[PDB]
Design a protein around this ligand. Sequence first.
Ligand SMILES: Nc1nc2c(ncn2[C@@H]2O[C@H](COP(=O)(O)OP(=O)(O)O)[C@@H](O)[C@H]2O)c(=O)[nH]1
Ligand SMILES: [Cl-]
Ligand SMILES: [Mg+2]
Length: 380
Amino acid sequence: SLVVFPFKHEHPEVLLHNVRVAAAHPRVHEVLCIGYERDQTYEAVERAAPEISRATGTPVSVRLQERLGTLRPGKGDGMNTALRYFLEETQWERIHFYDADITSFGPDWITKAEEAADFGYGLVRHYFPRASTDAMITWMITRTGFALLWPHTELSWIEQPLGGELLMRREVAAMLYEDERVRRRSDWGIDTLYTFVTVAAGVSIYECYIPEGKAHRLYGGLDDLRTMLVECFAAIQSLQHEVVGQPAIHRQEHPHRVPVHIAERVGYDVEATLHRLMQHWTPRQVELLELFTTPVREGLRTCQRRPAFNFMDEMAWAATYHVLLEHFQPGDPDWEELLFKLWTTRVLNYTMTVALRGYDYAQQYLYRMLGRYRYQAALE
Ligand SMILES: Nc1nc2c(ncn2[C@@H]2O[C@H](COP(=O)(O)OP(=O)(O)O)[C@@H](O)[C@H]2O)c(=O)[nH]1
Ligand SMILES: [Cl-]
Ligand SMILES: [Mg+2]
């Protein structure tokens, strides 16, 4: 099988460790790195490569991402080109993707995915314990959108639909390559597209639980996620009219108790986030708010003078979400900035009224939120 590591600016020592772990595994036929550009990281990998190819007997290739879609060129081009390499230049049955910056990686990850495919699954996704203030795009954008748009489907039940640790069978890789909406999705929206399309195609899905957890970057304010946010939301919005034709077998390994060191992390700088909410305003943003419900309109306007976010509760976010589905314009800086601030207030509301009540309370809240959104969407 093919194990792929997409990379951009990673410390190279860490990546090559994972490549070496992957190269040593008995069920791996070939490791492949797919890079952003020929940079400091890329060269270091190209050099270290054929040494590991012979020390383990497994072919390790480096290659550059090919421009395959119509959007900012990012992770999506990277994964879509690995898809092309996999399908056009190898005969392997299965392809793994793992993020290049994992520090807790080991052979079990590959073993567990492989064995679940043996069992008959077409797609295996890995999922991880997360802190209560992590994954706010996952929860407030992707899972929320899936739930409001396709409440009867398996979409909103996928644990980590932005997750880049997965395994596909060859015909799943092929079905996704042949898909226009997917090929197009060159930016951060790629994971959303893989998730939506594998589910809508009735691929059978298993989710393995990785107790180690995954290690996330040091955080400032939420603005470190602004681009991801805009792109993840545009992906959902671009699918809003699609129909999901058929059901899917979907099963998930029972999760362990969250490790204490993961429960006890804080995901982002609150002070910086509150500050950033008062910046980058334009009169056009003020006027664009006229499209939103009165409490959201006056709440966000208040942020010009002091931080406000009590108003952005669950119902207010659902109403806000529908307005954005209809009126948000990808690439319009004022829409991107409003999206970003609206979401910030949602994250802050959740953090102070829910996460602050404790880990268990927050988990329970997030699943119940999805359930209320689904029930509401099915009513309309
Ligand atoms: N080829 C390619 N890989 C990327 C790009 N952007 C991110 N990656 C890789 O995709 C993975 C996720 O990136 P990262 O910044 O760690 O995102 P996060 O883990 O979701 O916070 C890492 O393995 C990155 O090296 C890109 O534009 N092209
Ligand atoms: Cl996320
Ligand atoms: Mg990461």
